[PDB]
C-alpha cells in the first residue's frame, strides 16, 4: 500500500493559520482566521511534492489526537477534496496513520463517516468568507483512487 | 447605567454547546456541534429574565480571558443582535463587564470593533447548517438604546 | 433505543479523580491517582438510579470532546464492563450520546473498536496497583441486551 | 489532628479571580487581575469557618495537580500567611491534603521550600499594584500551631 | 510603513523563559520564572537585526491569540519599552502585525490602552524580583518614531 | 558537577509518543500509545551521546511546569532507571535542571520521592503491554554514580 509523510501545519481546533515556508523550513503565522472557525482536522502538506502551483500537495490526517506544529506523520491516503477559490484549483488529500492497525477499518472515502466529511467541507467553503477577495466556489470529495493517482502525479512533477 | 448579572453557559473558543438547565441550575450538554465551529464570545443568558421563548434573554459578554460554564459575571449593555431562526426571534444582548475602567471606552455598538460583530454575526448565521430543519437569519446589529429596551422588557416579563 | 441522563464526574485524559457527592451534589476531589494514567473515557454515573451497594450505577461515555465535572449527558447504552475489585462486584455502562446520529453505527459492543476496550480495561486493570490494599481482579464485556437489564434494575431499585 | 474541607475558588495558573457567593453557592467572576499576575496555588476558602471579617476563612492548597472551581479538597493546615491590606487584616490558611502519604512530609512550615513560600508572598503583595486604592502593607509567615489556632476560633464562630 | 518578521520566543500567559540560540537556532528552557508571573505579550525578536548587544532586538507583538515557540510573525512598530536592568539599557520594540487590517487602528503607542501598556510594564519592573544578581532601575515608554529608529541602527549593524 | 544538554521529546501529560530523527532533526510522532498512560515527567535524549543501541541516552527531566517538543534544559542527572524490554536493554537516566538552586536538595536517587519513582517505574513497565512484540522484563533504580558513569560511557563512544 501507498504511505508517504505528513508535515502538521495547522492543529485540529486551531484559528491560527500557520503555514511553514518551504525556502527556509519556518514555522510562520500567515493570519488568523476572520471567521469563528477552527481546522476541523490536523493540517499540512505531503513532503517531497510539488503541484501544479510552487507549493507541496495539501493534506489532512485524521487523528486520535493532534500534534503540533512541524510535526511529520506518517501516513497514507484513503480520499481526498477538491475545491476552488481565489486561485483555481486546491487539492487536499484525506489520510491515516500508516502502519497503525486503529486505521485499518478505513481503507476507503466511504469509509470515513459523511458527518467528519461534511464538517471538513464546510470549514474550507466557509473559513474565508469576511476575506476580501477570497472565496469558495465548488467542493467534493473523490476516493483513494483519485487520492493515489493526485499523489502519483505530484511526487513525479516534484521530481522533475 | 443599566447593569444585570449574566451567567456563562458557553465558553469562547468552544464546539460543546452547553446549557443550563433553568427549572434545576444543572449544566447540559445539549450537543456537539455539527459544523467545525466554535463561540466567538462567551455565551449564555441574564439571570431573571423572561423572553416569548419561555426561557431567558440570551447575552453575549467580550472578555479579556474566558470564563467556564456556570459562572455569574456583572455585566452592562453595549447593543444586541437579532436573528430569527427555525423558532422564530431569538435576540442576544451584546455586553461588557459591569464596572470595569478598562471597558468604559466601549458605550454603544459602534465601539466594538466591525471584525468582532462580523465574527459573532458569521457564527451564529452558520453554526447550524449542517443540522437539518434549522437555519439562521441575522436581521441586524441594533444599538445599546434597542437592547436596554428589549432587557427592561423581558425584566418585567419575569416579574410575573 | 433506551437512554438516561449520565452525570459525568471524570473528564477523559484526567487523573484527578473526581467524585460527586451524592447528597449535596457537590464536586470532590477525591485523590490525584497514583499510577501514571489517565481515564480513557468520560466517566461518572446514571441519574436516579441505585446499585446493589446503596450508590448509583457507573457510566463511561464515549464522545468526540470531553466535558467538565458535574455536567449532564443524555446517554444510550451500548455495553458493560463487569469487574471485582476490594469492594466486591464493580459494574460500569459503556455508553454514547443519545439522540445524536453521528453514533448510530454503534449499536452495541462488537461495534466498539477492540482497541478501545482493551484500553479500558487496561485503565481499571492497572490504576490502583501503586494503593496499598487495592485492586481489580475480573474484567469482562457483557453486551447491549445485559447492560439495558442492568440499567433497568438500578432504574427499579431506586423507585422503591 | 486537624483537618476540614476547602472549596477552591481559583486554580493555580489563574488570572481570573472568581469567587463563591457564600449565600447561594454560585461561582462569580469578580475581576480579571489588572497585573501580569497568577495565583501560585489553588485558592478558595475553609467550608463551616467565620472569620472576624464576616466572610469564610480563606485557604491556599498545594497540589500536584490543579482543580476547577468549585471543588471541594479535603485538607490539614500546615502554616499560614498573615497580610494587611486596605481593608484591614486577612489570614490565608496554607494547606495540603489530608489522608494523602504523598504530602506526610510537610508538617509545618518550615517543610515548605522557601522559593515556593517567597513566590506566594511576592503574589499577593504585588497583585494589586494596578488596583486603585488598593495595597498590601504587612506580610508575614506564621508557623502550624498559630494556624491551628485561627481555624478553631472561626469554626467556633460559625457555630453563632 | 516599516516592518520585520519577528520570531517568538514566549506566548503570552507563559512562566517559562524560553530563549532561542542565536548560532544554531535551537529553542532552550531558560528558566522557569521565580515570580509568580506571566508574559503578558507574545515576546521574540526581529529578525535579521543587531542589537548593541550583539543580540537581536527585543521584540513584544500584540494578537488576538498567541502562537508556538519559534513561530515567525510580519509586524510594524508601533512603540518601544525601555527599561534599565542589571544588564544596562534594555529595549524592546511594541509591535503590532504587519498587513492586518484588524490593527490598522494602532499606529503609535498612544493608540494602545493604558491598561494594557501598564501590565507589560509590571511585567519587566517585577518578574525578577526573587531572581538573585537581578534587578530593574526603570521603565518607560517611548513613541514609534524612536522605536524606528532604534530598528534601523539594528539593521545597519546586522549588515556590518 | 556533571551536567549536559537534554532535549525533551515528550511533555509530561502526553500519550503521543513523539520522536527527533537524529539525521534531519525533524520531530515526528512514532504513535499514539495503545495503553491509558501519560507519560509522567518530560522525556527526551541527552544531547552528543551515543548508547549501545546506537542512538543517544535517554533522559527523564524533572520540572515545575513541562515544555514543548525540541526544546533544550541545561540537565544534570541524580540517578538512572534501568529496563528490559524487546530490543534489548534500554537506560534512563533521571536529571533535574541545572543551575536552578529550586533543586539543589535533590543530590542523589534517595532525594526523589519514592510515590514518583515507583511512578515512573509503572510507566515504563506497562505503556507497551497492548503492543504486539513488545514487553519489558526487568526494571530498577540506580544512584547518580552509576548514572554517571554511564553518561560519560555515552559521551566517549559518540566521539569515538
Ligand atoms: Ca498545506
Ligand atoms: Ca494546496
Ligand atoms: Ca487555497
Ligand atoms: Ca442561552
Ligand atoms: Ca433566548
Ligand atoms: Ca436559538
Ligand atoms: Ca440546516
Ligand atoms: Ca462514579
Ligand atoms: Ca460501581
Ligand atoms: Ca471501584
Ligand atoms: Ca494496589
Ligand atoms: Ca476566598
Ligand atoms: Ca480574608
Ligand atoms: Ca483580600
Ligand atoms: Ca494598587
Ligand atoms: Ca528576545
Ligand atoms: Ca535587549
Ligand atoms: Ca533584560
Ligand atoms: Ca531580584
Ligand atoms: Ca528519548
Ligand atoms: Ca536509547
Ligand atoms: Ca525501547
Not at 78 to 85: A, I, L, S, T
Not at 86 to 104: T, Y
Not at 132 to 147: N, T, Y
Request: charged share 30%.
Amino acid at each position: 500500500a501507498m504511505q508517504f509523510d505528513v508535515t502538521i501545519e495547522i492543529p485540529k481546533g486551531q484559528r491560527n493559520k500557520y503555514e511553514v515556508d518551504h525556502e527556509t523550513g519556518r514555522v510562520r503565522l500567515d493570519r488568523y482566521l476572520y471567521t469563528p472557525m477552527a481546522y476541523p482536522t490536523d493540517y499540512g502538506f505531503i513532503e517531497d511534492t510539488l503541484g501544479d502551483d510552487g507549493d507541496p500537495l495539501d493534506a489532512l490526517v485524521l487523528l486520535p489526537q493532534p500534534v503540533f506544529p512541524g510535526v511529520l506523520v506518517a501516513a497514507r491516503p484513503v480520499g481526498m477534496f477538491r475545491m476552488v477559490d481565489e486561485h483555481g484549483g486546491d487539492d487536499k488529500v484525506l489520510c491515516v496513520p500508516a502502519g497503525d492497525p486503529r486505521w485499518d477499518h478505513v481503507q476507503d472515502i466511504g469509509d470515513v463517516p459523511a458527518f467528519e466529511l461534511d464538517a471538513i467541507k464546510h470549514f474550507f467553503v466557509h473559513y474565508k468568507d469576511l476575506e476580501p477577495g477570497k472565496f469558495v466556489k465548488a467542493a467534493d470529495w473523490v476516493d483513494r483512487a483519485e487520492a493515489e493517482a493526485e499523489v502519483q502525479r505530484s511526487v513525479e512533477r516534484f521530481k522533475a
